[PDB]
């Protein structure tokens, strides 16, 4: 069969693989994962004696065309409940007013449906100083925790660099969002699995992908392909077709050496353009719970911050002050959520320093100096890993779901597609959306072969 090599082994590599050689005919594949690991942005790690999610953890809305949903529900992933609470603290050590957040999220929200309905920033900065004493610092307060929840919602640095007019393409599907019970990584594993024995290399990542060319095979009949692909250990690997699955910031660093010749300038461009931020959790691990037994998300309000004075590029007056709080994960352990450049800063700092620094904003914020420190931390690391350079795409102030749609686009002949969250117009950032990407590759390539059989 014709020779197909799928460039990682995240989601979409892996449905793209899946779909391929199920194929009661199927070509000759291999998938080549940079990594030691197959899932990439699907990472489920044993700690505390449980499991920790590094990347992708819920089902964004689990319904019936959800194929995650559908997947999760074939390979007895989910929860029968599944299959079918917040706690507000100040940096002063008080809790905030329930109306007042009510207040706030009906504002914050209703505004944030209004851009679904220039930037996003700048239109909920404008809408919100329209309807702009301690009490004016309070709502102005909780709002700027709003926006650095949807910057981790959106993988951004901050909601000014998210394009205003493109925003409501992204496609909510119904249903409460879910976990997998079953850990997310089964999903990716149960696909790997699936596959023929000895498809996924790992440890072999692809350092240049060699198109338009006449590339002869070492062996006997010495035939030509048009593509040659280069791995970093010199592994020289003729084939017909290429599928790269690669993150989009892994091509904003490198798509320059990645492809030769360059890529045609419209899908460079769009590569540029796009938005690709980072999104980081903090697990911390407690002796005890010193939270309410019954609280899941404990939501962190920074006194006298507002969203109004901050811009595009502005910092917080300190990294931690850009951490939206904790879920409680159902050992007793907290998971902090963080974004943007004071999130790629936290991954500067050593385990130590994030734990000692935590446990000291813990301390402030439920207004006890006593509060035992916490016992372990693991975090993950997205702008720091090589073969990711961050959490997930949005569509920047710049680009459209044009670019979205360049991303997708096939080289001649589909000597190279294109598959991955990134390339998906209406489900980039998701695992769904990853997942539909390496299927509408497999999909075009069938039919590519159908045709030349036809003829
Ligand atoms: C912190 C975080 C939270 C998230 N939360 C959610 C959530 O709750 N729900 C949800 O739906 N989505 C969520 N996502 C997004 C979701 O995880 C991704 O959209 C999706 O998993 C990406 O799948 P992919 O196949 O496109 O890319 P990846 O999973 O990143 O796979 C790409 C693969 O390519 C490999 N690779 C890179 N360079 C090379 C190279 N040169 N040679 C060979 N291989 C290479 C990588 O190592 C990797 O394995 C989250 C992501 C993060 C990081």
Known sequence: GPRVLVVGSGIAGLGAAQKLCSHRAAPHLRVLEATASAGGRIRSERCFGGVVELGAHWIHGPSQDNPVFQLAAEFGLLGEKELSPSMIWSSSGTSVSLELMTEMARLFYGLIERTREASVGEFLKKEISQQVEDTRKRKLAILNTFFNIECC?????????????????????????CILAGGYQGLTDRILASLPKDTVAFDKPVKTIHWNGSFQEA?????????????????????????????????????????????????????????????????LEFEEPFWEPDCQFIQVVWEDTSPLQDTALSLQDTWFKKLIGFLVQPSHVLCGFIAGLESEFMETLSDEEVLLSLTQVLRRVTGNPQ????????????????????????????????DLDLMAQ????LQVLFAGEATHRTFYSTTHGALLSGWREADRLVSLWDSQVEQ
């Open 153 to 177: 919602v959106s993988g951004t640095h901050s909601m000014d660099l998210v394009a205003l007019a493109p925003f409501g393409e992204y496609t909510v599907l119904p249903g409460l969002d």
């Open 219 to 283: 062996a006997f009949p010495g035939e030509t392909f048009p593509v040659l692909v280069e791995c970093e250990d010199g592994a020289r690997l003729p084939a017909h077709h290429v599928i790269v699955t690669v993150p989009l910031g892994f091509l904003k660093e490198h798509q320059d050496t990645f492809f030769e010749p360059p890529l045609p300038a419209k899908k460079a461009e769009a590569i540029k353009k796009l938005g690709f931020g980072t999104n980081n959790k903090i697990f």
């Open 371 to 402: 509060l035992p420190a916490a016992k372990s931390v693991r975090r993950s690391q997205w702008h720091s890993a090589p073969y990711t350079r961050g959490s997930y795409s949005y569509v920047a102030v710049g680009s459209t779901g044009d």
């Open 410 to 413: 096939p080289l001649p002949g």
